[PDB]
Design a binder for these strands. Structure first.
Lengths: 89, 85, 84
DNA sequence: CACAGGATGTCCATATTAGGACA
DNA sequence: TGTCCTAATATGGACATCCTGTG
């Protein structure tokens, strides 16, 4: 059950059933958290972290910034992107 | 396999990664201060610990009699003098 | 089975003159080991000063903080603290 | 809000310590 | 101090939790 956010997030971006919650906003990696708080809800269920929310999840995302995995997209709300896509796969 | 790699052994040299280093600095400083207290109280002895953050914060633990060394004017200037040359 | 293992002792001043000492010497080598690991790994200034009941003072001080225990202004303030 | 970045805590799993007893 | 045996911890890695600050 060893999983990391970026893995989990991607796992959501490969399931169509999750398109109006989280969806690709481009073909070269960028994606958007349409229903941000929900993803958080689920991600806190995947890690068994009940009180999880976007204000905590995003913080993990921001840590990914310097770790060169996921960068924000200035301007576009809830939009992020993998930097080594589609390499990450 | 297991959920995490668990605690992993590291080379005892300088940490080039600004984040792994920063994280490690907290984790340790969190424990060393603990030891100081323990030793201090466990064997009832004076102990002065003084850790200076890579940024600027100066964490410190000091038993009563030593307190006057991070609380006194001279100490403060002395500690302060010891960090800009 | 063989040895009882590391006993979880209470964080209160040991009363057995002997044990105490035995602990003191071990934790000391250990904590100093730490001040070195912390110092080294993160490359941050660190000062450690421990003084036994005898009054023997032990110290660890990274390059920069050395003055804190070498200079007369410092070596003074110290002797001064271990008093009443 | 939505986003940045900092200090400190948490959980898993394993790398390091250090109480006893004895040299 | 120097080991041995053995349980008690400290703590890497990966976030989780709070928080201060900002347009």
């Amino acid at each position: 059950s060893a999983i990391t956010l970026w893995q989990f997030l991607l796992q959501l971006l490969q399931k169509p059933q999750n398109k109006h919650m989280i969806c690709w906003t481009s073909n070269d990696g960028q994606f958007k958290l349409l229903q941000a708080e929900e993803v958080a809800r689920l991600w806190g269920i995947r890690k068994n972290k009940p009180n999880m929310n976007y204000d905590k999840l995003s913080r993990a995302l921001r840590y990914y910034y310097v770790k060169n995995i996921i960068k924000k997209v200035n301007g576009q709300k809830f939009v992020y992107k993998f930097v080594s896509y589609p390499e990450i796969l | 396999g297991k959920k995490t790699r668990g605690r992993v052994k590291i080379k005892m040299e300088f940490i080039d990664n600004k984040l792994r280093r920063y994280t490690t600095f907290s984790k340790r400083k969190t424990g060393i201060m603990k030891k100081a207290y323990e030793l201090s109280t466990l064997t009832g002895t004076q102990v002065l610990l003084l850790v200076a953050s890579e940024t600027g914060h100066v964490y410190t633990f000091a038993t009563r009699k030593l307190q006057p060394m991070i609380t006194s004017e001279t100490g403060k200037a002395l500690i302060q003098t010891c960090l800009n040359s």
